Amino acid sequence: STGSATTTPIDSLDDAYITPVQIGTPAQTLNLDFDTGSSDLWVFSSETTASEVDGQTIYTPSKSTTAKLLSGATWSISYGDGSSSSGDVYTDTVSVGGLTVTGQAVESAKKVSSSFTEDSTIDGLLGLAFSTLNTVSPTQQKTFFDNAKASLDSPVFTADLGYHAPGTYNFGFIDTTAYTGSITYTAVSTKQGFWEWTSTGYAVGSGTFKSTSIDGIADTGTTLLYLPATVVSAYWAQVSGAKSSSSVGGYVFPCSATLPSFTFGVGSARIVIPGDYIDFGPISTGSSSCFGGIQSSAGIGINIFGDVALKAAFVVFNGATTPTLGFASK
Ligand SMILES: NCc1ncc(-c2ccc(F)cc2)[nH]1
Ligand SMILES: NCc1ncc(-c2ccc(F)cc2)[nH]1
Numbered sequence: 001s002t003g004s005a006t007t008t009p010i011d012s013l014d015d016a017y018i019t020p021v022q023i024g025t026p027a028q029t030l031n032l033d034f035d036t037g038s039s040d041l042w043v044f045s046s047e048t049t050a051s052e053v054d055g056q057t058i059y060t061p062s063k064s065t066t067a068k069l070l071s072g073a074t075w076s077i078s079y080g081d082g083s084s085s086s087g088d089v090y091t092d093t094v095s096v097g098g099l100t101v102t103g104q105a106v107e108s109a110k111k112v113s114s115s116f117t118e119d120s121t122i123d124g125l126l127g128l129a130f131s132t133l134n135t136v137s138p139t140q141q142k143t144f145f146d147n148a149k150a151s152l153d154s155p156v157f158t159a160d161l162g163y164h165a166p167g168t169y170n171f172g173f174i175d176t177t178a179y180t181g182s183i184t185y186t187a188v189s190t191k192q193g194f195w196e197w198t199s200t201g202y203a204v205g206s207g208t209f210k211s212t213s214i215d216g217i218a219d220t221g222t223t224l225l226y227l228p229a230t231v232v233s234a235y236w237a238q239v240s241g242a243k244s245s246s247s248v249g250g251y252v253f254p255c256s257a258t259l260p261s262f263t264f265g266v267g268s269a270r271i272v273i274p275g276d277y278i279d280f281g282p283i284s285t286g287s288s289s290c291f292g293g294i295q296s297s298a299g300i301g302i303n304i305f306g307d308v309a310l311k312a313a314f315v316v317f318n319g320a321t322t323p324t325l326g327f328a329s330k
Pocket of ligand 1: 015016119
């Protein structure tokens with residue numbers, strides 16, 4: 001089998017992307033944030049504290065003839081930015097782009113943090129990291145991809161995120177019309193539960209490529225590109241007036257600037273992030289200080305190849321027995 005679904009930016013900055021997902025019988029369609037940095041499929045629901053729902057579409061398990069309470073199971077997750085959610089668990093039928101999994105764990109939120117309440121466009125998350133990170137207790141549950149994998153034509157999914165435009169998540173096949181040149185594959189460590197890999201270096205603008213190993217994760221659920229302080233300083237030094245602001249929480253730059261591109265290495269291949277992809281706009285409405293899309297990872301403990309980086313590529317998440325990642329230009 002295969003599936004194919006369009007993913008759409010939630011706002012004019014590409015802060016996140018939402019993909020429609022059918023849950024239950026008859027189908028209830030929710031728009032979920034596909035997150036290769038976590039491993040829980042959780043939704044706003046009829047059980048979510050009413051004051052914490054503000055415009056989201058909710059899953060109502062009592063209206064689904066295929067929903068079953070997973071007795072005794074609870075979940076609770078905290079994300080790298082400090083957001084969080086928790087609740088109980090149903091199993092139900094879940095379909096993405098025509099690909100159907102029966103018996104998928106659908107984690108129903110009883111509580112969500114304010115950041116989620118405020119994102120009226122995000123009805124929940126669909127985790128696509130390794131199932132070892134799933135938070136369901138006392139019986140850990142499998143991700144949608146792990147449940148689907150044996151049925152897929154090939155044990156892969158691909159992320160093709162758009163810049164200020166829709167893109168595509170495919171399951172079970174590699175659309176050879178969706179990228180240019182060849183796909184370069186690179187090794188993955190699953191020891192931390194992430195799609196963790198090692199970039200071979202970077203360049204700033206038209207500058208020379210610096211060969212240096214940068215270990216990090218491919219994370220569709222993170223907006224920005226978080227890299228070591230040395231790398232990020234070298235980038236922003238090329239932008240007149242750019243500075244790290246403790247009060248704002250990262251590098252800012254004059255909105256009048258034209259930003260240089262940033263290149264990262266995948267083996268001997270190179271992915272170029274255009275400068276415009278690194279502009280996240282005014283820090284507050286009407287400000288002439290703009291927020292940078294490349295930020296330091298120093299306070300995080302891991303480097304994160306988030307949407308800023310991934311949207312410049314066609315990305316293969318290869319879930320074969322030994323997983324690997326593939327990157328192509330597009
Ligand atoms: N840097 C602060 C900030 N401004 C907007 C966001 C944001 C992030 C994710 C999301 F889904 C929606 C909005 N974060
Ligand atoms: N209210 C704005 C906002 N700040 C962080 C988030 C967020 C969105 C998606 C995600 F996966 C994790 C955090 N949204």
